[PDB]
């Protein structure tokens, strides 16, 4: 018995087009259909410079924007050998972590709105509209902040942003507590989530989950502890790791990972060195407006970096960061030219949404939206 | 194993005046009355809402909204036709054609940003050498018809003169970065 | 009649159709009106105390209806057959006999 389970609530899971082969109410197999959001991203990037390539990444995962620009930047610094300053690293993490918070605040309470709890959605989205007052203030666009450029980061924080991020972090433990007091204790929540989509660790490894769905099963594997790719080796934070694997562990993790991300934000705030914002290598970082206008040699680079590009040397690397969805890695083959060459984007949600087939076997049809909830399936990456 | 796991996870809470605690917190729905109480606290608290048309959400001088071609204080469009923004544009929205005007100084005969084919990433504002193209904080230009949304060659992007009073302010405050 | 006929029994029958389609001079005596007994009260004054065994026997008939609807329409959907497929290794040929 085949059922074309589509997007239950649009605007939350946009193009979800599962084709469930059911058995009464018990689902026997879930066959997701991809491509409804397949923009030509892995082709369009081959046609544009390494700078023009960056805006696609904030548009790859639309609920955790800067994590993908941070995964791309670290793939055009893996090749460029472009050492970025300490302040660029600290800002880059303070925003990758603000993005982890922006994602878990959505991927928890959009999940909690698919399950049925209507209010956590709107509380978490007031919180997200506080964090977009930081995105929009530091770069310009509330969602797609093309801000974490290859060398360092686009431009320094405004002169009042750390004070505001602090005044937000002080009041954010309470918001997590409310999102938690409203959902963690509920017997209507546990019942809707405990023993739902349980993934034994061998399955989370096999299906390349590598995210909050690889730390549910108990595999202690965070690419901020495994492969520290910034000040992360300096910052202190504990990676919460589940013990059962059910969608109630992944929720409890995403609601603790939203507190450890608060620890990382507070650290990045309390220790942010007053250094240069971009790599001093002005052939990888366009010089400031003031310098390119006054200096002829800076003007030449501002011209050959906003038209030509880097021309990062010939290589091929797989740089993977811990994006909120999971291990978002961008395999970036680079022909010597200024344009990338098959900038393949390993995006979790392409490996997670595979897991829907075995996660939601023998679960009731109303659980198939809870699974899609805890996978944090955002179809931009799929 | 799940059978033994159940037996043990239920033999953990197996001492009187603990079975009673759990029974009175699953019968007098007590986890749920802490949900209702929080929900009430938020029912009575002030509302984080904004009656939009009259007051609008906070922005920043770096905010990227409607593209505006700036002008030099003494008229003279700031847009010398280098085509750097036409080059840097990721979506290739800007189409620039250049002609030595009769005065002799280069200028763009055609400077058409296609707003629909535009990602509002501010690359044009960065790439332009003289700050000729900047994004005005407008962001309120929803058009009834698509053809209007294609911003014509240097005529509608020349409406930035109205927004110059705010664009000059944002630039005077952002240029420090 | 409303409840236990057109909210239960003809509900059953509707299910069996939808699925499984077939293809002046009175002298009112003002005594005994001083305390008017509603029909429920004057059925309960009897059914539960005086003729109570004809009420515990319909109890057994409702219990037999429960047992019957269970043993009939469990439809091998629970321990009736959801016990297991059942298998024994020692007797099993395991490729010795096909």
């Amino acid at each position: 018995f085949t059922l074309n389970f589509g997007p239950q609530h649009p605007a939350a899971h946009g193009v979800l087009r599962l084709v469930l082969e059911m058995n009464g109410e018990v689902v026997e197999r879930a066959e997701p259909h991809i491509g409804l959001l397949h923009r030509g991203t892995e082709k369009l990037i081959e046609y544009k410079t390494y700078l023009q390539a960056l805006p696609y990444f904030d548009r790859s995962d639309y609920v955790s924007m800067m994590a993908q620009e941070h995964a791309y930047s670290l793939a055009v610094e893996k090749l460029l050998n472009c050492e970025v300053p300490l302040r660029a690293q600290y800002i880059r993490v303070l925003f990758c972590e603000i993005t982890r918070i922006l994602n878990h605040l959505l991927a928890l309470t959009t999940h909690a709105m698919d399950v049925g709890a209507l209010t956590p959605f709107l509380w978490a989205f007031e919180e997200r509209e506080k964090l977009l007052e930081f995105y929009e203030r530091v770069s310009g666009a509330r969602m797609h902040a093309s801000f974490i450029r290859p060398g360092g980061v686009a431009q320094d924080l405004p002169l009042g942003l750390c004070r505001d991020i602090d005044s937000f972090t002080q009041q954010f433990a309470s918001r997590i507590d409310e999102l938690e007091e409203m959902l963690t204790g509920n017997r209507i929540w546990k019942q809707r989530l405990v023993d739902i989509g349980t993934v034994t660790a061998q399955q989370a490894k096999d299906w390349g989950f590598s995210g909050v769905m690889l730390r549910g099963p108990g595999v202690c594997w965070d690419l901020r502890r495994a492969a520290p790719y910034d000040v992360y080796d300096q910052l202190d934070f504990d990676v919460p790791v589940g013990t059962r694997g059910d969608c109630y562990d992944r929720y409890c993790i995403r609601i603790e990972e939203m507190r450890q991300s608060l620890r990382i934000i507070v650290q990045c705030l309390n220790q942010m060195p007053s250094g240069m914002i971009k790599a001093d290598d002005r052939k990888l970082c366009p010089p400031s407006r003031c310098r390119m206008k006054l200096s002829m040699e800076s003007s030449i680079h501002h011209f050959e970096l906003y038209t030509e590009g880097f021309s990062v040397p010939a290589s091929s690397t797989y740089t993977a960061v811990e994006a909120p969805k999971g291990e978002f890695g961008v395999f970036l083959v680079s022909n010597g030219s200024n344009r990338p060459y098959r900038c393949k984007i390993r995006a979790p949600g392409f490996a997670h949404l595979q897991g829907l087939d075995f996660m939601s076997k023998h679960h009731m049809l109303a659980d198939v939206v809870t699974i899609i909830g805890t996978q944090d399936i955002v179809f931009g990456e799929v | 194993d799940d059978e033994e796991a159940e037996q043990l996870a239920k033999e953990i809470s197996k001492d009187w005046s603990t079975v009673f605690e759990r029974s009175m917190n699953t019968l007098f729905l007590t986890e749920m009355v802490r949900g209702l109480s929080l929900t009430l606290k938020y029912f009575f608290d002030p509302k984080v809402t904004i009656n939009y048309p009259f007051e609008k959400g906070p922005l920043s001088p770096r905010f990227r909204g409607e593209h505006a071609l700036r002008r030099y204080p003494t008229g003279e469009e700031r847009c010398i036709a280098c085509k750097l923004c036409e080059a840097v544009c990721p979506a290739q929205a800007i189409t620039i054609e250049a002609e030595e005007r009769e005065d002799g100084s280069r200028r763009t005969t055609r400077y058409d940003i296609d707003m629909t084919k535009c990602i509002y990433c501010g690359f044009c504002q960065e790439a332009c050498p003289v700050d000729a193209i900047v994004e005005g904080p407008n962001f309120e230009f929803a058009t009834e018809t698509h053809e209007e949304l294609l911003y014509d060659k240097e005529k509608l992007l020349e409406n930035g003169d109205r927004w110059e009073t705010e664009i000059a302010e944002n630039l005077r405050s952002e240029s420090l970065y | 009649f409303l409840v236990v006929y057109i909210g239960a029994i003809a509900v059953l029958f509707l299910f069996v159709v939808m699925m499984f389609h077939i293809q002046s001079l009175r002298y009112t005596v003002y005594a005994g009106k001083v305390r008017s007994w509603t029909n429920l009260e004057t059925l309960g004054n009897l059914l539960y105390t005086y003729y109570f065994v004809w009420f515990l026997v319909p109890s057994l008939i409702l219990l037999v209806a429960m047992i019957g609807a269970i043993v009939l329409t469990m439809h091998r959907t629970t321990k009736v057959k959801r016990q297991d497929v059942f298998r024994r290794n020692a007797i099993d040929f395991r490729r010795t006999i096909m």
């Binding site: 013990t243 059962r244 409890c252 603790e256 679960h363 | 159940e6 996870a9 | -």
Partner: peptide, 24 residues
């Protein structure tokens, strides 16, 4: 249906960090 029902019993909540709390 013999499908495995979602048993809503489990072990009690105990926040499980990684071993790198104090000294890696």
């Amino acid at each position: 249906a013999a499908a495995a029902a979602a048993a809503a019993a489990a072990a009690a909540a105990a926040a499980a960090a990684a071993a790198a709390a104090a000294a890696a």
